Amino acid sequence: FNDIAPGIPSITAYSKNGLKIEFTFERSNTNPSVTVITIQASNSTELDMTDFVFQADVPKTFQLQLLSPSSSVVPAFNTGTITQVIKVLNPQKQQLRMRIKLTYNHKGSAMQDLAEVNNFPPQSWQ
C-alpha cells in the first residue's frame, strides 16, 4: 500500500514575498531528453503583482524553450494564476539545474529576485 501520485512529483520552486511559483513536469512520450514544465505563479498578498516576467537559465549542456505566458498580472487574493510553459532539453540526462530570474512591480516597488531551483526531483531528468 503506497499513496504517491504516479508520475513526476510537483514542486514549489519558489515562494517569497507572497509570490509562489509551482512547477509540474511532463516527460515527452517520444523524446527521452525532453521535459515540459508548466509554471503556475500565484499571489497570496492584497496587491496585484504587475508586469511579471519569468526568465530562466540552464547549464550549457542543456537547451531551454520558454513559451509565452498567459498574462503579466499575478492577481491579488489568489483569484487567479499566471501559467507559462517551459521546455527543457537534457541530451546527456545530467542533474537538472535552473536559475530563475523574476521581475515585477508590487506595492509601489520594482521587485527583483534571482534564485536557484534546488528541489528538482530525480524523475524530471533521469
How many CB atoms are closer than 10 A to CB 16?
A: 11
In the complex with Cl ion, the residue whose CB is nearer, 15 or 50, is 15
Residue whose C-alpha is closest to residue 76's, from 104, 43, 109, 107:
43
Please give the residues from 80 up to 109 whose contact with Cl ion meets the rule CB under 5 A.
Answer: none
Site string for Cl ion, 3-42 (x = CB under 5 A): --------xx------------------------------
Rounded Cα distance between 18 and 8, Å, is 25
In the complex with Cl ion, the residue whose CB is nearer, 12 or 92, is 12
Structural contact between residues 114 and 99, judged by C-beta atoms closer than 8 angstroms:
yes
123 contacts Cl ion (rule: CB under 5 A): no
Which residues would be at the binding site for Cl ion (CB under 5 A)? 11-12
